[PDB]
Write an enzyme that holds these catalytic residues in place. Sequence first.
Site, PDB file in Angstrom:
ATOM      1  N   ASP A 162     -92.721-109.495 -43.762  1.00 14.72           N
ATOM      2  CA  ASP A 162     -92.084-110.011 -44.933  1.00 14.72           C
ATOM      3  C   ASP A 162     -90.950-109.634 -45.618  1.00 14.72           C
ATOM      4  O   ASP A 162     -91.591-108.343 -45.663  1.00 14.72           O
ATOM      5  CB  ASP A 162     -92.750-110.405 -46.230  1.00 14.72           C
ATOM      6  CG  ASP A 162     -91.840-111.872 -46.951  1.00 14.72           C
ATOM      7  OD1 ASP A 162     -91.166-113.009 -46.905  1.00 14.72           O
ATOM      8  OD2 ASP A 162     -91.166-110.988 -47.784  1.00 14.72           O
ATOM      9  N   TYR A 186     -84.232-105.739 -49.419  1.00 16.66           N
ATOM     10  CA  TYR A 186     -84.667-104.855 -50.098  1.00 16.66           C
ATOM     11  C   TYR A 186     -84.997-103.291 -49.527  1.00 16.66           C
ATOM     12  O   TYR A 186     -85.171-102.657 -49.722  1.00 16.66           O
ATOM     13  CB  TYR A 186     -86.483-104.871 -49.500  1.00 16.66           C
ATOM     14  CG  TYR A 186     -86.963-106.928 -50.082  1.00 16.66           C
ATOM     15  CD1 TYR A 186     -86.729-107.784 -51.012  1.00 16.66           C
ATOM     16  CD2 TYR A 186     -88.149-107.093 -49.077  1.00 16.66           C
ATOM     17  CE1 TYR A 186     -87.071-108.182 -51.508  1.00 16.66           C
ATOM     18  CE2 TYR A 186     -88.965-108.064 -49.438  1.00 16.66           C
ATOM     19  CZ  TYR A 186     -88.462-109.395 -50.950  1.00 16.66           C
ATOM     20  OH  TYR A 186     -88.626-109.342 -51.208  1.00 16.66           O
ATOM     21  N   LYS A 204     -84.686-113.280 -45.338  1.00 17.44           N
ATOM     22  CA  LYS A 204     -84.134-114.001 -46.416  1.00 17.44           C
ATOM     23  C   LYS A 204     -82.455-113.968 -46.431  1.00 17.44           C
ATOM     24  O   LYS A 204     -82.338-112.184 -46.551  1.00 17.44           O
ATOM     25  CB  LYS A 204     -84.599-113.687 -47.403  1.00 17.44           C
ATOM     26  CG  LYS A 204     -85.779-113.427 -48.006  1.00 17.44           C
ATOM     27  CD  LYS A 204     -87.236-113.521 -49.258  1.00 17.44           C
ATOM     28  CE  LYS A 204     -89.167-113.192 -48.791  1.00 17.44           C
ATOM     29  NZ  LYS A 204     -88.933-112.012 -48.582  1.00 17.44           N
ATOM     30  N   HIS A 245     -82.665-117.407 -50.029  1.00 18.35           N
ATOM     31  CA  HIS A 245     -83.704-116.336 -51.000  1.00 18.35           C
ATOM     32  C   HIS A 245     -83.640-116.568 -52.342  1.00 18.35           C
ATOM     33  O   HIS A 245     -84.555-116.225 -53.141  1.00 18.35           O
ATOM     34  CB  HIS A 245     -83.213-114.644 -50.916  1.00 18.35           C
ATOM     35  CG  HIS A 245     -84.402-113.503 -51.261  1.00 18.35           C
ATOM     36  ND1 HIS A 245     -84.439-112.482 -50.611  1.00 18.35           N
ATOM     37  CD2 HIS A 245     -85.162-113.383 -52.205  1.00 18.35           C
ATOM     38  CE1 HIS A 245     -84.999-111.377 -51.138  1.00 18.35           C
ATOM     39  NE2 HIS A 245     -85.656-112.328 -52.580  1.00 18.35           N
TER      40      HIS A 245
HETATM   41  N1  LIG Z   1     -89.119-114.629 -52.522  1.00 15.86           N
HETATM   42  C1  LIG Z   1     -88.680-113.793 -53.457  1.00 15.86           C
HETATM   43  O1  LIG Z   1     -88.554-113.784 -54.053  1.00 15.86           O
HETATM   44  C2  LIG Z   1     -90.447-112.522 -53.545  1.00 15.86           C
HETATM   45  C3  LIG Z   1     -90.057-111.875 -54.675  1.00 15.86           C
HETATM   46  C4  LIG Z   1     -91.036-110.780 -55.078  1.00 15.86           C
HETATM   47  C5  LIG Z   1     -92.402-110.299 -53.580  1.00 15.86           C
HETATM   48  N2  LIG Z   1     -91.855-110.920 -52.605  1.00 15.86           N
HETATM   49  C6  LIG Z   1     -92.830-111.082 -51.282  1.00 15.86           C
HETATM   50  O2  LIG Z   1     -94.246-110.477 -51.944  1.00 15.86           O
HETATM   51  C7  LIG Z   1     -94.600-109.266 -51.707  1.00 15.86           C
HETATM   52  C8  LIG Z   1     -95.856-108.694 -51.855  1.00 15.86           C
HETATM   53  O3  LIG Z   1     -95.009-109.494 -53.643  1.00 15.86           O
HETATM   54  P1  LIG Z   1     -95.329-107.736 -55.193  1.00 15.86           P
HETATM   55  O4  LIG Z   1     -94.913-106.577 -53.829  1.00 15.86           O
HETATM   56  O5  LIG Z   1     -94.351-108.108 -55.316  1.00 15.86           O
HETATM   57  O6  LIG Z   1     -96.427-107.411 -55.193  1.00 15.86           O
HETATM   58  P2  LIG Z   1     -98.252-107.618 -55.075  1.00 15.86           P
HETATM   59  O7  LIG Z   1     -98.368-107.404 -53.307  1.00 15.86           O
HETATM   60  O8  LIG Z   1     -98.608-108.479 -55.395  1.00 15.86           O
HETATM   61  O9  LIG Z   1     -98.518-106.016 -55.504  1.00 15.86           O
HETATM   62  C9  LIG Z   1     -97.884-104.858 -54.638  1.00 15.86           C
HETATM   63  C10 LIG Z   1     -99.153-103.777 -55.379  1.00 15.86           C
HETATM   64  O10 LIG Z   1    -100.098-103.373 -55.460  1.00 15.86           O
HETATM   65  C11 LIG Z   1    -100.484-102.395 -54.638  1.00 15.86           C
HETATM   66  N3  LIG Z   1    -101.551-102.939 -54.333  1.00 15.86           N
HETATM   67  C12 LIG Z   1    -101.415-103.279 -52.527  1.00 15.86           C
HETATM   68  N4  LIG Z   1    -102.689-103.644 -52.262  1.00 15.86           N
HETATM   69  C13 LIG Z   1    -103.714-102.748 -53.266  1.00 15.86           C
HETATM   70  C14 LIG Z   1    -104.838-103.060 -53.162  1.00 15.86           C
HETATM   71  N5  LIG Z   1    -105.816-103.070 -52.448  1.00 15.86           N
HETATM   72  N6  LIG Z   1    -106.109-102.015 -53.737  1.00 15.86           N
HETATM   73  C15 LIG Z   1    -104.928-102.135 -55.150  1.00 15.86           C
HETATM   74  N7  LIG Z   1    -103.614-102.212 -55.299  1.00 15.86           N
HETATM   75  C16 LIG Z   1    -102.985-102.694 -54.357  1.00 15.86           C
HETATM   76  C17 LIG Z   1     -99.270-101.764 -54.346  1.00 15.86           C
HETATM   77  O11 LIG Z   1     -99.489-100.417 -54.004  1.00 15.86           O
HETATM   78  P3  LIG Z   1     -99.384 -99.629 -53.071  1.00 15.86           P
HETATM   79  O12 LIG Z   1     -98.014-100.694 -52.038  1.00 15.86           O
HETATM   80  O13 LIG Z   1     -98.073 -98.125 -53.590  1.00 15.86           O
HETATM   81  O14 LIG Z   1    -100.504 -99.330 -51.758  1.00 15.86           O
HETATM   82  C18 LIG Z   1     -98.538-101.897 -55.061  1.00 15.86           C
HETATM   83  O15 LIG Z   1     -97.897-101.214 -55.955  1.00 15.86           O
HETATM   84  C19 LIG Z   1     -93.590-108.211 -51.727  1.00 15.86           C
HETATM   85  O16 LIG Z   1     -94.015-107.115 -51.042  1.00 15.86           O
HETATM   86  C20 LIG Z   1     -92.156-109.553 -50.209  1.00 15.86           C
HETATM   87  O17 LIG Z   1     -92.460-108.752 -49.207  1.00 15.86           O
HETATM   88  C21 LIG Z   1     -91.079-112.358 -52.452  1.00 15.86           C
HETATM   89  O1  LIG Z   2     -86.149-111.256 -55.299  1.00 20.00           O
HETATM   90  C1  LIG Z   2     -87.430-110.929 -54.700  1.00 20.00           C
HETATM   91  O2  LIG Z   2     -87.643-111.179 -53.578  1.00 20.00           O
HETATM   92  C2  LIG Z   2     -88.194-109.814 -55.043  1.00 20.00           C
HETATM   93  O3  LIG Z   2     -86.566-109.225 -56.845  1.00 20.00           O
HETATM   94  C3  LIG Z   2     -85.865-108.066 -56.024  1.00 20.00           C
HETATM   95  C4  LIG Z   2     -85.780-107.400 -55.283  1.00 20.00           C
HETATM   96  C5  LIG Z   2     -84.980-106.706 -54.524  1.00 20.00           C
HETATM   97  F1  LIG Z   2     -84.714-105.971 -53.909  1.00 20.00           F
HETATM   98  C6  LIG Z   2     -83.557-106.723 -55.582  1.00 20.00           C
HETATM   99  C7  LIG Z   2     -84.033-107.526 -57.050  1.00 20.00           C
HETATM  100  C8  LIG Z   2     -84.897-108.068 -56.650  1.00 20.00           C
HETATM  101  C9  LIG Z   2     -85.374-109.820 -57.863  1.00 20.00           C
HETATM  102  S1  LIG Z   2     -84.718-108.667 -60.107  1.00 20.00           S
HETATM  103  N1  LIG Z   2     -85.441-110.599 -58.198  1.00 20.00           N
HETATM  104  C10 LIG Z   2     -85.800-111.611 -59.731  1.00 20.00           C
HETATM  105  C11 LIG Z   2     -84.364-112.260 -59.166  1.00 20.00           C
HETATM  106  C12 LIG Z   2     -83.474-112.139 -58.468  1.00 20.00           C
HETATM  107  C13 LIG Z   2     -82.587-113.031 -58.531  1.00 20.00           C
HETATM  108  C14 LIG Z   2     -82.629-114.660 -59.255  1.00 20.00           C
HETATM  109 BR1  LIG Z   2     -81.447-115.886 -58.999  1.00 20.00          BR
HETATM  110  C15 LIG Z   2     -83.972-114.207 -60.045  1.00 20.00           C
HETATM  111  C16 LIG Z   2     -84.884-113.537 -60.118  1.00 20.00           C
HETATM  112  F2  LIG Z   2     -85.097-113.212 -60.909  1.00 20.00           F
END
Ligand SMILES: NC(=O)c1ccc[n+]([C@@H]2O[C@H](COP(=O)([O-])OP(=O)(O)OC[C@H]3O[C@@H](n4cnc5c(N)ncnc54)[C@H](OP(=O)(O)O)[C@@H]3O)[C@@H](O)[C@H]2O)c1
Ligand SMILES: O=C(O)COc1cc(F)ccc1C(=S)NCc1ccc(Br)cc1F
EC number: 1.1.1.21
Length: 312
Positions: A44, A49, A78, A111
Site C-alpha cells: 500500500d 507519503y 492513491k 485518497h
Molecule cells: N488511506 C489513508 O488515508 C491511510 C491513512 C493511514 C494509513 N494508511 C495506510 O495504512 C498503513 C498502516 O497504518 P499506519 O502506518 O497508520 O499504522 P499501523 O500499521 O497501525 O502501525 C504502524 C506502527 O506499528 C509498529 N509496528 C508494526 N508492527 C509491529 C509489531 N509486530 N509490534 C509492535 N509494533 C509494530 C510500526 O513500527 P516500525 O515500523 O518501527 O516497526 C509503526 O510504528 C499505512 O502505512 C498506510 O499504508 C492509509
Molecule cells: O492520509 C494518509 O494516508 C495518512 O496521513 C497523512 C499522510 C501524509 F503523508 C501527509 C498527511 C497525512 C494526514 S495529515 N492525513 C490525515 C488527513 C488528510 C487529508 C484529509 Br481531507 C483529512 C485527514 F484526516
Amino acid sequence: MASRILLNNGAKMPILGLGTWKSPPGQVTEAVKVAIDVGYRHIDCAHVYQNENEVGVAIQEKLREQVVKREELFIVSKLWCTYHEKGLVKGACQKTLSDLKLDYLDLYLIHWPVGFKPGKEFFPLDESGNVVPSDTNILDTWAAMEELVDEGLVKAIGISNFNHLQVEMILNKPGLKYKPAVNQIECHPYLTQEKLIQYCQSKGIVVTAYSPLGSPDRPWAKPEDPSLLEDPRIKAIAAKHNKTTAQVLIRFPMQRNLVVIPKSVTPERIAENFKVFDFELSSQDMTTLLSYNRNWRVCALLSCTSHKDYPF
Ligand SMILES: NC(=O)c1ccc[n+]([C@@H]2O[C@H](COP(=O)([O-])OP(=O)(O)OC[C@H]3O[C@@H](n4cnc5c(N)ncnc54)[C@H](OP(=O)(O)O)[C@@H]3O)[C@@H](O)[C@H]2O)c1
Ligand SMILES: O=C(O)COc1cc(F)ccc1C(=S)NCc1ccc(Br)cc1F
C-alpha cells in the site's frame, strides 16, 4: 483462510499488505524487499507519503531477481487531494507509476473525498490556516478515475476515507461506468466501523482496514491517547493464542472479510506480522474485540474540517 479476496472487477486482492506511510526513504527499500521475501504480495503506497521512488526500487529489484512475477504482486496507490481536477489525474497516476517502476497499478484510490487547490503544496492553506478547497466534486473525480481503467494505467479503482453518504453518491452517479472496488478506511478495535463496513460489503465493495495497530508512530500522537498494542485485554487474547498483540490485531480484520495493511520497517516485525494465517480467533474473541470500540480516530485533521466534503 484463503490469502486473497475477489474484487468486483474480477481480480483477486491479497488480504494482507504492507503499509508504507512514515516508512523512511532510507529504510523502505529494504522493508519492501524483506516483505516480498517473506511472502507479502500487496504493498500500500501513496504519492503523498513521498517514498514511492524508494518503494519502487524494491519492487523492481524483486521482479528483476525473479523472486516474484508482476502478475503475483498487487500494488496500490492513491490520488492526492491536490490532483482532483480532470486535467491532472492522469499525470498524477503516471508520476506514481514512474516512481514505482510500474506500467500499471492493481488498484488506484481517491485518497480522501476532498479536493484542494492544485500546486506544489500538499496542504495549501489560507492565511488563517484553513485548507484551500477545489471546486471539483467527487463525481467528476470518479469519472477521471474511470478513464484510467480505460487507458490501461490501472486494473481497479476505488476510494478511501469515504463516508456512507459519499460511497452512496458514487454508487448513484449518473452514468457510473465502474463501481469502486475498495473503500480503504481506518479500522481497529477502538474504531470498529460496523455500520460503514456493513454498507460497503452489502454493495460488493471490499473494505481495507488501515492503521490496524493504532498507528503508534503517527506524528500527532499524545501521551494520554489509547494504545491498542498495550491494552491488557488485547494482550490477554494474544497470550491465550500464543501470538503477539500485533498478530491478533492483524487477524481481527481478516476474520471480518477485510483486507489489512500493517506498516513496519523492522524486518522481524514485517515477518511477524505475516504469520497470521495459522490461527483463528473465536467468535467470542471477535465480539470481545469489537466491544472495545470508542470511535477513536488516528486519522483526522483540523485544518480540513471546514471543507464541504470532509468525511467525519
Ligand atoms: N488511506 C489513508 O488515508 C491511510 C491513512 C493511514 C494509513 N494508511 C495506510 O495504512 C498503513 C498502516 O497504518 P499506519 O502506518 O497508520 O499504522 P499501523 O500499521 O497501525 O502501525 C504502524 C506502527 O506499528 C509498529 N509496528 C508494526 N508492527 C509491529 C509489531 N509486530 N509490534 C509492535 N509494533 C509494530 C510500526 O513500527 P516500525 O515500523 O518501527 O516497526 C509503526 O510504528 C499505512 O502505512 C498506510 O499504508 C492509509
Ligand atoms: O492520509 C494518509 O494516508 C495518512 O496521513 C497523512 C499522510 C501524509 F503523508 C501527509 C498527511 C497525512 C494526514 S495529515 N492525513 C490525515 C488527513 C488528510 C487529508 C484529509 Br481531507 C483529512 C485527514 F484526516
